[PDB]
Design an enzyme around this catalytic site. Structure first.
Site, mmCIF file in Angstrom:
data_model
loop_
_atom_site.group_PDB
_atom_site.id
_atom_site.type_symbol
_atom_site.label_atom_id
_atom_site.label_comp_id
_atom_site.label_asym_id
_atom_site.label_seq_id
_atom_site.Cartn_x
_atom_site.Cartn_y
_atom_site.Cartn_z
ATOM 1 N N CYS A 184 0.795 -1.235 0.000
ATOM 2 C CA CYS A 184 0.000 0.000 0.000
ATOM 3 C C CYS A 184 0.821 1.275 0.000
ATOM 4 O O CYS A 184 1.633 1.514 0.903
ATOM 5 C CB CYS A 184 -0.970 0.023 1.188
ATOM 6 S SG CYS A 184 -2.059 1.483 1.379
ATOM 7 N N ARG A 212 -0.013 4.443 2.947
ATOM 8 C CA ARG A 212 0.234 4.297 4.374
ATOM 9 C C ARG A 212 0.561 5.538 5.208
ATOM 10 O O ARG A 212 0.568 5.464 6.427
ATOM 11 C CB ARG A 212 1.299 3.224 4.595
ATOM 12 C CG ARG A 212 0.790 1.840 4.258
ATOM 13 C CD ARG A 212 1.820 0.822 4.572
ATOM 14 N NE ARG A 212 2.787 0.734 3.497
ATOM 15 C CZ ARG A 212 3.866 -0.016 3.548
ATOM 16 N NH1 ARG A 212 4.111 -0.727 4.636
ATOM 17 N NH2 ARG A 212 4.668 -0.091 2.497
ATOM 18 N N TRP A 215 -9.314 6.026 -0.309
ATOM 19 C CA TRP A 215 -9.698 6.793 -1.491
ATOM 20 C C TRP A 215 -8.794 6.369 -2.671
ATOM 21 O O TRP A 215 -7.728 5.806 -2.470
ATOM 22 C CB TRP A 215 -9.642 8.315 -1.226
ATOM 23 C CG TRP A 215 -8.366 8.854 -0.659
ATOM 24 C CD1 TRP A 215 -7.194 9.083 -1.331
ATOM 25 C CD2 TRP A 215 -8.141 9.274 0.686
ATOM 26 N NE1 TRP A 215 -6.255 9.626 -0.485
ATOM 27 C CE2 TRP A 215 -6.813 9.756 0.762
ATOM 28 C CE3 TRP A 215 -8.933 9.294 1.844
ATOM 29 C CZ2 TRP A 215 -6.261 10.256 1.951
ATOM 30 C CZ3 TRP A 215 -8.381 9.793 3.030
ATOM 31 C CH2 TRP A 215 -7.065 10.266 3.072
ATOM 32 N N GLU A 219 -5.375 3.849 -10.616
ATOM 33 C CA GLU A 219 -6.110 2.613 -10.391
ATOM 34 C C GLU A 219 -7.298 2.575 -11.370
ATOM 35 O O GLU A 219 -7.624 1.518 -11.917
ATOM 36 C CB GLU A 219 -6.631 2.526 -8.954
ATOM 37 C CG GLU A 219 -5.576 2.673 -7.852
ATOM 38 C CD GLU A 219 -6.192 2.518 -6.469
ATOM 39 O OE1 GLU A 219 -6.750 1.433 -6.216
ATOM 40 O OE2 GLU A 219 -6.127 3.467 -5.647
HETATM 41 C C1 HEM Z 1 -6.206 6.588 2.182
HETATM 42 C C2 HEM Z 1 -6.227 6.079 0.914
HETATM 43 C C3 HEM Z 1 -5.390 5.046 0.506
HETATM 44 C C4 HEM Z 1 -4.686 5.067 -0.673
HETATM 45 C C5 HEM Z 1 -4.583 6.233 -1.703
HETATM 46 C C6 HEM Z 1 -4.208 3.711 -0.855
HETATM 47 C C7 HEM Z 1 -3.634 3.287 -2.053
HETATM 48 C C8 HEM Z 1 -3.483 1.950 -2.394
HETATM 49 C C9 HEM Z 1 -3.226 1.498 -3.722
HETATM 50 C C10 HEM Z 1 -3.011 2.362 -4.937
HETATM 51 C C11 HEM Z 1 -2.997 0.188 -3.647
HETATM 52 C C12 HEM Z 1 -2.796 -0.761 -4.827
HETATM 53 C C13 HEM Z 1 -4.180 -1.268 -5.254
HETATM 54 C C14 HEM Z 1 -4.132 -2.120 -6.512
HETATM 55 O O1 HEM Z 1 -3.281 -1.864 -7.394
HETATM 56 O O2 HEM Z 1 -4.960 -3.035 -6.638
HETATM 57 C C15 HEM Z 1 -3.132 -0.207 -2.268
HETATM 58 C C16 HEM Z 1 -3.005 -1.542 -1.800
HETATM 59 C C17 HEM Z 1 -3.358 -1.910 -0.523
HETATM 60 N N1 HEM Z 1 -3.844 -1.053 0.467
HETATM 61 FE FE1 HEM Z 1 -4.023 0.963 0.413
HETATM 62 N N2 HEM Z 1 -4.607 2.829 0.181
HETATM 63 C C18 HEM Z 1 -5.333 3.662 1.048
HETATM 64 C C19 HEM Z 1 -5.995 3.188 2.205
HETATM 65 C C20 HEM Z 1 -5.870 1.862 2.687
HETATM 66 C C21 HEM Z 1 -6.469 1.407 3.906
HETATM 67 C C22 HEM Z 1 -7.496 2.198 4.779
HETATM 68 C C23 HEM Z 1 -6.001 0.159 4.117
HETATM 69 C C24 HEM Z 1 -6.252 -0.716 5.200
HETATM 70 C C25 HEM Z 1 -6.784 -0.357 6.400
HETATM 71 C C26 HEM Z 1 -5.179 -0.176 2.975
HETATM 72 C C27 HEM Z 1 -4.679 -1.501 2.717
HETATM 73 C C28 HEM Z 1 -4.109 -1.904 1.531
HETATM 74 C C29 HEM Z 1 -3.815 -3.284 1.221
HETATM 75 C C30 HEM Z 1 -3.876 -4.464 2.209
HETATM 76 C C31 HEM Z 1 -3.330 -3.260 -0.079
HETATM 77 C C32 HEM Z 1 -2.901 -4.424 -0.994
HETATM 78 C C33 HEM Z 1 -4.200 -5.100 -1.420
HETATM 79 C C34 HEM Z 1 -3.978 -6.252 -2.381
HETATM 80 O O3 HEM Z 1 -2.976 -6.978 -2.209
HETATM 81 O O4 HEM Z 1 -4.818 -6.436 -3.291
HETATM 82 N N3 HEM Z 1 -5.081 0.889 2.089
HETATM 83 N N4 HEM Z 1 -3.500 0.905 -1.492
HETATM 84 N N1 DP9 Z 2 -7.064 2.686 -2.997
HETATM 85 C C1 DP9 Z 2 -7.420 1.441 -2.637
HETATM 86 N N2 DP9 Z 2 -7.149 0.475 -3.499
HETATM 87 C C2 DP9 Z 2 -7.384 -0.980 -3.442
HETATM 88 C C3 DP9 Z 2 -8.757 -1.310 -4.036
HETATM 89 C C4 DP9 Z 2 -8.893 -0.879 -5.515
HETATM 90 C C5 DP9 Z 2 -8.021 -1.699 -6.500
HETATM 91 N N3 DP9 Z 2 -7.833 -0.835 -7.691
HETATM 92 C C6 DP9 Z 2 -8.645 -3.066 -6.890
HETATM 93 O O1 DP9 Z 2 -9.527 -3.117 -7.757
HETATM 94 N N4 DP9 Z 2 -8.192 -4.150 -6.238
HETATM 95 C C7 DP9 Z 2 -8.527 -5.599 -6.567
HETATM 96 C C8 DP9 Z 2 -8.044 -6.065 -7.961
HETATM 97 N N5 DP9 Z 2 -6.654 -6.491 -7.667
HETATM 98 C C9 DP9 Z 2 -6.447 -6.840 -6.233
HETATM 99 C C10 DP9 Z 2 -5.979 -8.314 -6.251
HETATM 100 N N6 DP9 Z 2 -5.087 -8.766 -5.370
HETATM 101 O O2 DP9 Z 2 -6.396 -9.120 -7.097
HETATM 102 C C11 DP9 Z 2 -7.854 -6.626 -5.628
HETATM 103 N N7 DP9 Z 2 -8.019 1.174 -1.479
HETATM 104 N N8 DP9 Z 2 -8.180 1.919 -0.380
HETATM 105 O O3 DP9 Z 2 -8.547 1.327 0.699
HETATM 106 O O4 DP9 Z 2 -7.988 3.179 -0.359
#
Ligand code: HEM
Ligand code: DP9
Ligand code: HEM
Ligand code: DP9
Ligand code: H4B
Ligand code: H4B
Ligand code: ZN
Lengths: 407, 411
Positions: free
Chosen positions: B108, B111, B280, B285
């Protein structure tokens, strides 16, 4: 034991067994991955040599033949006797093609088998080296119709008589630190550009001064040589829509030729093995021209395009980036100089990977390096799972000579 | 042992000691790197040590390690485990654990916002209907009329593994995908399988290109149930371009709240199988992956035609030009409608600062380069030039198998 790699765009799954022949270490462990880190005796020699010959003879369908057994014994004797050995020309060529074949960071490996090998093992001096290099540059450039090549100087003996090409590439621009604190030319070469002066070079202090070769033979001190200007093919950079682009006065050389790596074949080490292929557009357009620590020209190009550079969310840097890259490819193609775009290069790599999986059981690949520095996910390699491991023969990094040489 | 990472654009070098607290495996060995692989009921025996490590981390965080409150808590949990085979987390520990699972999520890039997570405790929930209610409240709170706030809702933890709470949707809000008999796909191809499951469960699909899917909720191990999120609670943004007036005619729009709902949250050994969370969107994405992946909406050609680009040869970089414009369109639309969103330059720049701060105050920051670097313009964002170390710390968010594959239907 048998690992699988899936392509998330096509669902195609491939099985990898080749990694089982891995010998060297990756840098990673079960607790920590270092996948994004840039740089992670007669007794030791014979096993290496044996491994090599076995793979060589197996490749020529003569595994466990008399020829195999004989050569195997001959090298054994030679090693026990001379504490080293020499490769037949056939083994030299095979080892070189394979070090390329095994370079996990190279996206252009579908061309591996066509490598032209220049045996320069009989070389003894810096002028000799210079002669061999000019010949390589001219053969490889081929008037713009580039051909892959590598020139292999004498192998290591006692480390105190190593051949080395001090340049990082045969052809690179100089870098000078001006009073302004700013840097003139290529910042990546500033240091080397000084070690040349410290040796005598008469720097023309321009934005694109082709550096001079600093060749080291048999361990002696390095000597300078100015590559025949007529042998260095350069391309003036102009856009196919923005006539003002040409005013930036940007140009790049057509021959990319890494000269500071070490080639290892059957335990033998070759510290001077310059090699060359041709550029993938992005190397110049994205990294050389836009890296902040390089020619860093994004702002200038941005201004000339009259983009709103007030907010990053306008994506002005991204728009400029695309144009700077369209011009490089355009400029090279117009002057009939070989170059490949990231879309075409990555497509070919995927095709190469598939062939390798079914004819060799796999293909070591470093995703961090294979994926282009722009438009990543619109290229197919982005969606391709890859396994990274070290196979030999191989190309390895080695310490800069000026930080090891005893003058 | 100390591990250094270097930024090749600024020459800054950081030292990492945090990796020493890493227990879980990476999937890699000394002989092979698996850095680019997407996916490389506990016993009393293995539970108390896990609980203990967590409590120790928790009490150190509040500057009360070794205190009487600390020792009494360890004794209470230990007694509770041997007594019931499991244990309940206090509200404070739950909140701390959730924030830390986010803080430890190596994939992520957002963070820097980790400590501001709003945590909703739904451990008293007993039915799918109840789950629906908690989720609606989550969506409404998090959306906040476009000024998004990070949130996570936590359902009862796993007990014997036959009574799990699961949200079958992969994200609270997603568009349906429909496979046509002529082999083409309407809507979002990524959600075709789940969409079929919904229709089979009785959902009446409107069969359009952007139909918000219904929630399929599983409580206490029972069969899942369908619920439609009140439309007024789903914030959507029409996509248009700041200069190309024909962009709006593409008929594109996207929801504003990204909410992963299929991951498993692990805290002190406890397993929370239903823990939807949301933040958000980072522009790419939507603009790069959701719109331009060949396997998703795949709009690059149509956008390139309209722009009238030279699509005769990839070397004109038409795909790259169109990509940039589509991405400008997404950011412009969100900003115009006042819905929170961040561009990749801003997000990656913030992540670098967050990362440095973590190395200095925490001793490190596990990061997955393959996922951190944006899917477009990689090298012009600072993260591309940043060496990273990836390892697994707990609390954490983990993948889990899709429920339709493991569920024992009761009918
Ligand atoms: C505040 C806004 C946040 C932004 C802009 C952000 C951004 C992102 C983005 C761009 C990714 C990659 C998603 C993808 O390519 O599928 C990601 C992955 C991730 N984020 Fe964040 N995130 C945010 C909030 C959170 C929150 C609130 C949590 C958890 C409490 C979190 C947990 C994760 C996890 C576990 C992944 C990897 C998910 C996966 O393996 O599919 N994120 N985040
Ligand atoms: N900005 C995100 N992003 C994560 C969710 C959107 C992301 N573009 C999505 O579609 N995630 C799916 C497709 N690929 C991930 C997977 N491991 O297969 C889950 N979440 N957030 O909490 O602020
Ligand atoms: C024929 C055309 C070729 C193409 C299109 C190609 C393309 C590339 C590209 C794009 C990279 C990344 C460059 C960087 O980011 O610095 C690379 C790296 C590399 N290539 Fe190739 N290459 C070609 C020929 C060769 C040849 C002939 C060899 C050797 C005989 C070779 C050996 C390697 C090695 C060892 C690396 C990684 C070097 C490093 O770590 O800095 N390549 N190549
Ligand atoms: N296309 C190439 N490219 C490799 C050489 C050019 C590359 N763009 C370059 O400047 N490489 C330097 C900078 N980074 C590498 C490193 N490991 O530090 C060496 N080679 N070829 O033989 O066809
Ligand atoms: C820190 C990170 O490893 C570094 O910036 C890498 C990333 N990927 C790369 N990929 C290629 N082809 N070339 C490079 O120089 C790099 N640099
Ligand atoms: C195969 C490869 O790991 C895969 O395509 C990854 C690459 N990097 C990614 N990075 C992010 N943020 N999201 C993704 O879905 C992916 N997919
Ligand atoms: Zn690894």
């Amino acid at each position: 034991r048998f690992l699988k790699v899936k392509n998330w765009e096509t669902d195609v799954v491939l099985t990898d067994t080749l990694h089982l022949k891995s010998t060297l270490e990756t840098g990673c462990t079960e607790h920590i991955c270092m996948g994004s880190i840039v740089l992670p005796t007669k007794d030791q020699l014979f096993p290496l040599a044996k491994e090599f010959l076995d793979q060589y003879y197996s490749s020529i369908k003569r595994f466990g033949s008399k020829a195999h057994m004989d050569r195997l014994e001959e090298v054994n004797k030679e090693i026990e006797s001379t504490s080293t050995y020499q490769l037949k020309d056939t083994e030299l060529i095979y080892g070189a093609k394979h070090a390329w074949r095994n370079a996990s960071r190279c996206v252009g490996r579908i061309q591996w088998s066509k490598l032209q090998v220049f045996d320069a093992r009989d070389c003894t001096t810096a002028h000799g080296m210079f002669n061999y290099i000019c010949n390589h540059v001219k053969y490889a450039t081929n008037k713009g119709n580039l051909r892959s090549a590598i020139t292999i100087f004498p192998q290591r003996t006692d480390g105190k008589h190593d051949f080395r090409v001090w340049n990082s590439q045969l052809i690179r621009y100089a870098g000078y630190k001006q009073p302004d604190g700013s840097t003139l030319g290529d910042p990546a070469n500033v240091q080397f550009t000084e070690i040349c002066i410290q040796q005598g070079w008469k720097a023309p202090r321009g934005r694109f001064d082709v550096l001079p070769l600093l060749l080291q033979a048999n361990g002696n001190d390095p000597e300078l040589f100015q590559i025949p200007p007529e042998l260095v093919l350069e391309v003036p950079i102009r856009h196919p829509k923005f006539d003002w682009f040409k005013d930036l006065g940007l140009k790049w050389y057509g021959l990319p030729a890494v000269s500071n790596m070490l080639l290892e074949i059957g335990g033998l080490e070759f510290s001077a093995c310059p090699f060359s292929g041709w550029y993938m557009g992005t190397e110049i357009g994205v990294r050389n021209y836009c890296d902040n620590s390089r020619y860093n020209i994004l702002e200038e190009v941005a201004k000339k395009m009259d983009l709103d550079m007030r907010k990053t969310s306008s994506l002005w840097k991204d728009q400029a980036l695309v144009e700077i890259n369209i011009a490089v490819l355009y400029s090279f193609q117009s002057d009939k100089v070989t170059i490949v775009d990231h879309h075409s290069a990555t497509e070919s790599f995927i095709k190469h990977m598939e062939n390798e999986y079914r004819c060799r059981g796999g293909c070591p690949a470093d995703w961090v390096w294979i994926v282009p520095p722009m438009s990543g996910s619109i290229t197919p390699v982005f969606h391709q799972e890859m396994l990274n491991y070290r196979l030999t023969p191989s190309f390895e990094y080695q310490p800069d000579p000026w930080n090891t040489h005893v003058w």
